Structure formats: C-alpha cells, structure tokens
Write a protein that binds this DNA or RNA. Sequence first.
RNA 1: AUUAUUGCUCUUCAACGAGGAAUUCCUAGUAAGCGCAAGUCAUCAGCUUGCGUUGAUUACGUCCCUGCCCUUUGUACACACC
RNA 2: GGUGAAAUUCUUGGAUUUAUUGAAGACUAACUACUGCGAAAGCAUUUGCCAAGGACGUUUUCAUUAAUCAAGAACGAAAGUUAGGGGAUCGAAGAUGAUCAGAUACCGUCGUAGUCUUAACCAUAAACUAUGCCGACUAGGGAUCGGGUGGUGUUUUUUUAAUGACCCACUCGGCACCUUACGAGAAAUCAAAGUCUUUGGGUUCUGGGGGGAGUAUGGUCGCAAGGCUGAAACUUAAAGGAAUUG
Lengths: 25, 127, 214, 63, 97
Amino acid sequence: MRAKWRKKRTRRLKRKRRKVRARSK
Amino acid sequence: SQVFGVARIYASFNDTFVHVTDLSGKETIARVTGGMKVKADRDESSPYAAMLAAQDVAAKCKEVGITAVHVKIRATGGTRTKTPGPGGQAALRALARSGLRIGRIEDVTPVPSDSTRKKGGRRGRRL
Amino acid sequence: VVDPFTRKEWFDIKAPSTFENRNVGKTLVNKSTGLKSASDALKGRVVEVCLADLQGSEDHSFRKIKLRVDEVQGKNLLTNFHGMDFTTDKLRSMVRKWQTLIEANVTVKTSDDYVLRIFAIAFTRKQANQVKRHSYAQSSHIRAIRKVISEILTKEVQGSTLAQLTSKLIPEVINKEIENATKDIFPLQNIHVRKVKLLKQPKFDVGALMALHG
Amino acid sequence: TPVTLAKVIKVLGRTGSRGGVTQVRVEFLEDTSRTIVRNVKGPVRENDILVLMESEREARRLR
Amino acid sequence: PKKRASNGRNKKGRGHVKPVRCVNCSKSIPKDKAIKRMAIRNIVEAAAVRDLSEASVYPEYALPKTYNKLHYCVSCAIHARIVRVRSREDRKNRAPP
RNA sequence: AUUAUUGCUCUUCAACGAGGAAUUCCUAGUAAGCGCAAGUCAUCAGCUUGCGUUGAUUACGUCCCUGCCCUUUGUACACACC
RNA sequence: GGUGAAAUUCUUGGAUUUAUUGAAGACUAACUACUGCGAAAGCAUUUGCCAAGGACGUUUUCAUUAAUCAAGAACGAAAGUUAGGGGAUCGAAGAUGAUCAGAUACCGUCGUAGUCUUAACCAUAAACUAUGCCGACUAGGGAUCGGGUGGUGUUUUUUUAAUGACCCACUCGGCACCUUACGAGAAAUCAAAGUCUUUGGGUUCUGGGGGGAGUAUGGUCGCAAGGCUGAAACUUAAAGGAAUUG
Ligand SMILES: [Mg+2]
Ligand SMILES: [Mg+2]
Ligand SMILES: [Mg+2]
Ligand SMILES: [Mg+2]
Ligand SMILES: [Mg+2]
Ligand SMILES: [Mg+2]
Ligand SMILES: [Mg+2]
Ligand SMILES: [Mg+2]
Ligand SMILES: [Mg+2]
Ligand SMILES: [Mg+2]
Ligand SMILES: [Mg+2]
Ligand SMILES: [Mg+2]
Ligand SMILES: [Mg+2]
Ligand SMILES: [Mg+2]
Ligand SMILES: [Mg+2]
Ligand SMILES: [Mg+2]
Ligand SMILES: [Mg+2]
Ligand SMILES: [Zn+2]
C-alpha cells in the first residue's frame, strides 16, 4: 500500500494504543 | 450613412448569444440564441444553430429599424476559458451575409489582472 | 400581444464640439408618458464610439471615447464626455516579449473641477544597431520614467477642464513631450495615455455645458 | 444560366479522407490568363475540360 | 533514473516560482514548468474575410487579431497540443519550429 | 427402400410482388450468368475440386472505417497483460 | 446552466444576455525569460518612510582577528491548533445528480472548516541539485546579469560637446547552457561525481543485507495533532541500482 497511507495507518494505530494504555494510568 | 447599433456576441461553449442593442446600450432590440433555434441540449453551441440565430436576429433588426451595427464578440472570460467559442464566427458570418452593414469590431472578454481561484481545484479536472 | 415597437419613441444622438461629426447615432426610449416619461427617466446614458469612427481618419483607429448625455431638447440629445479607452487588440499588439512594459498613472483635477485618473504606458525599444536580443531597462531607469511621466501629466491637466485637456489628448502632444523628457534616460516606444477614466464631475451647470454647443 | 468552361492544367493530387477527390488547376478559355484550383469527383488527367457552374470560389483541403 | 537536466522543466537559482492554472483542466502547475503558446489569430476566420469586408462600411477597414497566451498542464500538453514524445536524443532539442 | 435412395407420369399449386438493422466477395477474359467432368458413389449433389462457354459496370486512389506491420516511448512484466 | 452524454439546479422572481452606478474580500494577469535577489523557507502594481546586503572600485584602515562545527539558538512552504477580525473566491467534511454489478470515488450541484489578517502555537515537505562547508589545482566555446577599465566605435543635434541608450576588446563576481574528456563511474552520467590501490589539504554529518519499523520502551517538547531521541525478540536469500534484449 502507498507509503503515506501506511504512515497514516500507524499514526491511527498509535493513537489507539495511546488510548488503551491510558485506561490503566 | 446607415443607422448604427451594437451587435455584441457572447460566444461561449455549450451556447452562443447574439443580441443587438442601442449604441448607448441601455435599450436592447431582438436577441435569440443557439439554444433556441434547435433542441438537443448538446447541440446548443454548434455553428448551425448560431447561424439560425443570426438569421432571426437580422430579421427583427431589419424589422424594427437598425440598418447597421458594430460587433463586440466575447468568450466566457473571467477565470474561465478565455478562447472564442464555436458559434460566434459563424454568427458573424451569418449576420454579415444577412444584408446588414458592418463597422469596427473589438473584443470585450473580461480579462482579469488575474485571480480569484479558478474552479476544479489544484489536482485539475481529471477524467 | 403588444410588440413595444408600435409604442417606442425614437431618437438621435449628437456629439459635442472638438471632433468631426456631431451627428453620432440613433436610439430608442418610450413615449414621454405622464408618470414615467422619456425625459428625466433616462437619456443620461453613455455611448461607446471609436474616435476614428467620429474623426474620420484612421490614424486613430484605437483610442475609444465615452460620450455621456446630460441635457436634452426634443429629438436633439446633446452629449459631453465620460472618458477615453483603448482598443483591446491594439494594446495586446504592443505587449511583445523581450522588452519592458513601463506603466504609470496619476489622479488629478482641472479648472472646471472634474476629477480624473489618467494613465500612461510605454515600452523600451531596441537601439537601431543593437546586437543583444532583448533590451530591458534598469528599474532605477523605470522609476525615473514614471516620476517624469507623472511630472508631465500633472502639468498637462488643470488646463481648461477636460475641454482643453480633450483638445490636448486628440493631437497626442503629451505622447511627444514624454518622449522628449525621456530619451535622456532610455529609448522607449509606443507611449500612449491609453486610458483616462474621469470619475468625479462638479455640478450640472447648464451654462458651460450648453457653451460647448451651437 | 451562365456556363463557364475551364481547361485543366497540372494534376495537383488527392484530398478527401477517402481520396476520390482530386485537386487541380485550370485556365478558362473564354478569356484566359487566369488560374483557379478546383475539386473534382471523377478521374482526371491533364487537358480535360471542366464545367465550372460558378466561376469564382476555389477550395483547398478536404476532410 | 533522472530523465532530464532541466528536471521537470527549467528553474535554476530560485527554488520557488508560482503556480499558473491550466487552461484546459484547471490544474495548478509552476509557471516555469508551464508550456506556453501565444495563440494569435484573426477575429474572423478563413472564408469569412471576403463576406466581412463586403458587407461593411469603410475601405477594407483594418482588421484586428486576437492575442491569447495559453497555459497547458503537461497532461493537457501531451493529450493534444505540443507533445508528441521524442526519442532519448531529440528530447534535448529546445529549438521550436 | 416403411421414417417415402433415386428416376418417370398425371394431379395438387403454398410462400415469395426485390427484401429492416445489418453483412459477404470481387479489378479483366476478372465479376456475374451458364452448364460439364472429377472426388464421394451399389443407389443418392441443392457439396466440393477443377473445366470451359457468354461476358460487363466501376477504381487504377486514399487512410475515413476495420485489421495488421514498423518506429518512437513507459514498464516493477521475462511462465512475458491469460 | 452544465457535461462524453445528462441530470440535480435557475427561470412573471423577466432569469441568462445588456446598461449605469455601488459594496466587500482576495489577487497582482499580459510584460515574465534556461532573467534578478535572499540563509533557506521564499520574493513580481505605485509611491513614502525604516533599517539591511552582495558584487565591483579602492597606492584606505585593522593585522591572523580565521576554516568547520557536538551541545545551544534564530528563521522555517502548505496544512493544522488558540483567541479576535474577515469571510469575495475556490473549497477536506457533509449532503446530493448521475456513472457503475457495486461507486463510500472520479465528473456535476449545494457548501461547513479552511483559504485572508492580528496576537500566539506547531517545526514538518520529493524543505530536491535526491549531491555539506572552506581551500588549491586540472579544458575548450558562444550567450547573459551586476561592477569596473580601455576606444581620433555607432546613434541622439544645437554649434560642437556633456550626458543617455547601443557596438567592439578586456577583467573581476553571478544565474546558466554548449562541446569535449585528459580524468571518474556499476552504468545513466559527471568541470566535478576530476586531480584514489601511484590510496593523506582542513573540517562537520550520516550509512553498514532485507523485513520486523521509524514499531515497542524510557526521556523530552507540544493545547492537540504530533516533533526529537529510538531498540529488540522473531523472520528471511535475497531485497535493491544502472544498463541490455524481448
Ligand atoms: Mg477508568
Ligand atoms: Mg486521463
Ligand atoms: Mg530502471
Ligand atoms: Mg520511470
Ligand atoms: Mg522548495
Ligand atoms: Mg458424380
Ligand atoms: Mg461434403
Ligand atoms: Mg502587473
Ligand atoms: Mg468562507
Ligand atoms: Mg461525499
Ligand atoms: Mg448515489
Ligand atoms: Mg463518505
Ligand atoms: Mg526530514
Ligand atoms: Mg527538485
Ligand atoms: Mg569554462
Ligand atoms: Mg565606458
Ligand atoms: Mg527498455
Ligand atoms: Zn491540464
């Protein structure tokens, strides 16, 4: 897949793991 | 020697306008377009209809009082094409061949010291 | 079921003084009916006519004129002045590549207090033995030419209204004096006033207006 | 009804996308000293004789 | 690899010019990469010139052409106008005709 | 020899009154008309392969349509755009 | 009106066309170029003001004051964020007409944010010449921008000059192109990508098969979006570059 979309793919992925981890602070 | 007026021919694509007016402009006399003298929507701008509209225009012109005229032909202009449409030269051809007189013809397409973003966005109208 | 042409009143338009044929053209109005009439309602329009079409000669084919209508007197509709333009094609014909377009303008007043903004345009010319292919000037050049052009324009106006300004434009004396003051800086060619757009008239004053007619 | 006769001089070539049409230059005999290029439909060679139904409207390219 | 020394098209000592809008598709494209045609032509046309002169006051008048700069976008420049595509060598030729 | 191999005789006497959209072949002894011999064959040519007989109209061109070939050009394909 | 063709749409509300005058915000057409300038981002209407700069000229002055740079800092396209203003245009989103097997699109319409500006953020772009900076040397040519020097050059007329623009020669410093190649390269190519196994002028920075991955983690910056710094386990025989023929 286009690199830029994959860069966007993981941006999203990251912001999510940012969320889940926050439930636990 | 004749009686003078203004022809003024907006010839864009998808239609061609002709309408003679008073040399002052305010009072206009006889109009009709290409979109009129045939029905087909896609054939609204072909030289054929334009001629037929120059016919109807000449007919009423020589029916009310104008014996001569000066033309100001004109493309869409502004932030659009700027190049003369199909059925203006044909409208010209047909209104000179009519029997009316002709004198001095300048173009009046609005050309800007450019700007206001053109439509269709940066990546272009793509098809 | 009407056809307004069996109803329209018909008219003819007369020019002012410092030209050729005052008899300019024809027009249509409407019968001077009680409640909305042929008089006050309109007439006060404007007319686009090439001055070569109203001077006779063709060394004038460009330079367009706007006549405005102020006073009327039954079938005899008298006009004065609204400004001056340029044929769009003539201008487009001078804007050649490989040279400099220099353009300048100034807003100023006359005696009979009409306010106008007049224009001025010139292009650098090749020296008639030049070898390099383009020929541009040098900004410090340009700047000089403008400040002088303006110095010349603010002079030529405040003559007797447009009336004498009009009589100054028609034989293009401005164009030559320009060339004169200039040639001490850079070549240049064409050089015309190009445009002048009026924009503020004083008061009606039926005297002086009529004073241009007879 | 005016008849106008012209003698064909030099074959110019084929136009018309199909190519049935042949360009050619002529010289009318009734007062010579004047050339015109015409478009033909039939087969033509030099010295053939064409009837110009009208005597002044020459053409060029054909699609 | 690199296909041209002008890269895309003609800019050396600047880094930024300014987009023009394509006349045919409205695409933005740098001014110096533009591909530009001065379209000058008579206001009349081919056969209309006789009919025009004849049905007029004035001796032969004057006649004015229409002067129009044209800005195509490359794809628009290729799809019709000036384009062909040239061999590896003929590409190098900047001469017009 | 019935689901009639073919041939002959009388009788019966259909559609078809030049064929929409479309489509085929063809440039000279050619096209078209016309039969004949041969293959097959016990018997069966409305098929074919050839043959001569009668004998034209119209091009002698072009790239519009369709098909292909060539160059230039892109390619991340090479089991090669299935 | 719009398109390949249409439709959604707009039309007693005289639309669209015309004419005269007015308002708003944005923009700087043509001239504009293998042309200019700036550290880079970037910078094209006029005029006033405010400070800045390179190149040149220089028998001026100081005299080694310099080169390059971890850390640290100034500036930093577009988008995006905060608070106001602005809000013409074009227009992420959304909604719609069509197309399609489907069509969350491409094309058409409406149009929110935005686009502009002020005061603060953000710090990233294929931010590109995919080529660090200073210094030396090595080869030809015609153009061009700035500066300077030279000529009983051309042109401007006045009375000859003085000016000014132009022509020729030269010379510093620019933006580039042309031709060769001694030379370099895996080649494409390259006046540097040359003067390298005949391997050392000075200095900074980065890379060490491909994925895993610019991911996890910790630190730090940010209002946010995110920026900087940045692993491993595991997997895998190739991935990749240039050129050649199909
Ligand atoms: Mg909780
Ligand atoms: Mg396409
Ligand atoms: Mg390759
Ligand atoms: Mg490629
Ligand atoms: Mg950049
Ligand atoms: Mg047999
Ligand atoms: Mg068989
Ligand atoms: Mg400008
Ligand atoms: Mg808005
Ligand atoms: Mg949507
Ligand atoms: Mg739908
Ligand atoms: Mg959606
Ligand atoms: Mg980066
Ligand atoms: Mg680049
Ligand atoms: Mg050199
Ligand atoms: Mg000198
Ligand atoms: Mg290849
Ligand atoms: Zn385009």
